[PDB]
Structure 1
Amino acid sequence: VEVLEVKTGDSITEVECFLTPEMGDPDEHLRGFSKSISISDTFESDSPNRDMLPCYSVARIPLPNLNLMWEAVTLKTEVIGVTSLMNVHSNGQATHDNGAGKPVQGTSFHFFSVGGEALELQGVLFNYRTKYPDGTIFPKNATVQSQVMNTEHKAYLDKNKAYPVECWVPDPTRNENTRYFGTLTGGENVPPVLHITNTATTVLLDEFGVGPLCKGDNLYLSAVDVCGMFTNRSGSQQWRGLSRYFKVQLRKRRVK
């Protein structure tokens, strides 16, 4: 694609939506939570249940039909419902005798991307002998080299509630037509730090002034917002996730 001039004047459109989190939803009451975590006694017996595995969120958003391509230029984003983590009274584990419940805390992954095609993924496994469950899409034909880098494990984020967070990352060797951003903060005691504001804009243009170009007039939004773990009275722990807001401004760009 040779990228030519931006159209001016009906030349702009805006996408506004939320992506709900996919933490595992172990029953009809627990949308936004995983199953409580259980630990294998060996690497060879690691066999996580599907409802215990957070997955990447993805939305494919149809744009007004053009034939010109829609170019994504700016992003406003934030995590929705941050104050829900102040619920320290719902059968949690008292931090000490007569105390409030331990708040959601521990390992977090906050990730979002905007692209003109599916996010491209590279698989990396903590433990190559993990048995990933039916109904997930995971690195296949894993070897011990999969624990550091096995170039066989290439995939597209092309299905919601399917690609487990722990076995996939954005492929840095691809994603020319996507902008992605993420932070992993690890540790059982890590405090959530979540900022909200409607005054912050991210520019999606690359060093040549070109944003993601939407193939087939489709915009791809992807997210993970694992906020940490909720600790039950019993000590059992569940991942807790929150929805992500996206507002994307697009303009019409001529290409050859």
Structure 2
Amino acid sequence: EVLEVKTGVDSITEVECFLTPEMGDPDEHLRGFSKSISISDTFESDSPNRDMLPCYSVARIPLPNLILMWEAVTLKTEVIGVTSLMNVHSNGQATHDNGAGKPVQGTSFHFFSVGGEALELQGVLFNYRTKYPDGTIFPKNATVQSQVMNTEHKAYLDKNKAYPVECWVPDPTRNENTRYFGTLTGGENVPPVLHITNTATTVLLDEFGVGPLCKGDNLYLSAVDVCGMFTNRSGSQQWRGLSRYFKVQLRKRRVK
């Protein structure tokens, strides 16, 4: 039972933060990058290293202690550091003789969610025989059906640096208390197109005028911003991610 919104000065609050990307971080200098990508010699021997796998980012944000629940009403969000991708001089692969370095480009996934509980995930595997590495949380008891839909693969995005992007998507059969948005753009030559502005707001209310309700006074923010790949001089390629800004406005809602 969702009842009335509380009003008055005390009745609203705001959460602001940045979620850093988790692209694999293969050494102490490579925060925001994955390990260079290697290709298995056969389909059945696919065995990616942990540091080669971008993962979902998640933050649980504590809210002012309050039945009243905080209701998330609006979101401003954008990718932070878009202009860093203009560094075309840091030992990249020249576009042609005497040219500048190739910029970050290729397959991207840009995703964010705001919810009153952890994002609920459904597993789908490109190749069910992929051996996922220690330190990741991946679909278990994979079968050939996992390549299209195996309803056994349910999870909560409840840990950082853990749930690989390629194994998991938001579960559309759940997530009633979350609003999620994502775009996959695939292809090795896809250009990043990244917009920034402090004038754009997304409303998180459903068709009944109710936003995510924050259980235990916690707000869940999740993101992925794989921008593409950086190509080194040698031709090796690494995923590159960037952080995402969130500003969420919340109001006190009475519930029964």
Coarse TM-score class (shorter-chain normalised):
over 0.9
Distance (Å, rounded) in 1 between the aligned partners of 2:155 and 2:76: 27
Distance in 1 (alpha carbons) for counterparts of 2:129 and 2:211: 40
Match of 2:32 in 1: 32
Answer whether contact 2:15 2:247 (CA < 8 A) is retained: yes
1:227 deviates by 0.1
Given the alignment of the two structures, is residue 8 of structure 1 paired with residue 7 of structure 2, yes or no? yes
- Count matched residues: 255
Aligned to 2:63: 63
- Residues in 1 aligned to 2:65 and 2:120: alpha-carbon distance in whole angstroms: 24
Equivalent residue, structure 2, for 1:253: 253
Q: For each residue in 1:31-71, what CA deviation from the matched residue of structure 2 results, as whole angstroms up to 9, or x when unmatched?
A: 00000000001111000000000000000000011060000
How far apart are the structure 2 equivalents of 1:228 and 1:19?
18
Whether the 8 Å CA contact 2:67–2:254 is kept in 1: the answer is no
Contact 2:110–2:184 (CA<8 Å) still a contact in 1?
yes
Contact 2:62 2:218 in 1 (8 A): yes
Between the aligned partners of 2:94 and 2:156, the Cα distance in structure 1 is 43
Question: Partners in 1 of 2:248 and 2:145 — Cα distance?
Answer: 39
Matches within 5 A, 1:86-101: 86-101=86-101
| DSSP-derived class of the 1:152 partner | coil
Q: How far apart are the structure 2 equivalents of 1:190 and 1:164?
A: 22
Structure 1 stretches lacking a partner, 5+ long: none
Tell me the alpha carbon deviations over residues 95-117 of structure 1, each in whole angstroms, 9 at most, x when there is no partner. Answer: 10000000000000000000000
Q: CA deviation at 1:192?
A: 0.2
Between the aligned partners of 2:59 and 2:43, the Cα distance in structure 1 is: 34
Give the 3-state SS of the residue equivalent to 2:222 in structure 1.
Answer: strand
Superposition pairs for residues 38-77 of structure 1, below 5 Å? 38-66=38-66, 68-77=68-77
Partner of 2:103: 103
Q: d(CA) in 1 for partners of 2:177 and 2:109?
A: 23
- Contact persistence 2:67–2:255 (CA under 8 A): no
Residues in 1 aligned to 2:156 and 2:103: alpha-carbon distance in whole angstroms: 35
Counterpart Cα distance in 1 of 2:28 and 2:106? 25
1:169-214 deviations in whole A, cap 9, x for unaligned?
0000000000000000000000000000000000000000000000
Unaligned runs of 5+ in 2: none
**Contact 2:106–2:189, Cα closer than 8 Å, also in 1:** yes
Partner of residue 23, structure 1 = 23
How many angstroms apart in 2 are the aligned matches of 1:227 and 1:44? Answer: 28
Q: Percent identity?
A: 100
* 1:85 counterpart SS class: helix
Structure 2: distance between partners of 1:26 and 1:231: 16
Contact 2:24 2:53 (8 Å CA) reproduced: yes
**Deviation string for 1:223-251 (max 9, x for gaps)?**
00000000000000000000000000000
- Secondary structure of 1:73's counterpart equals strand
SS in 2 for 1:76: strand
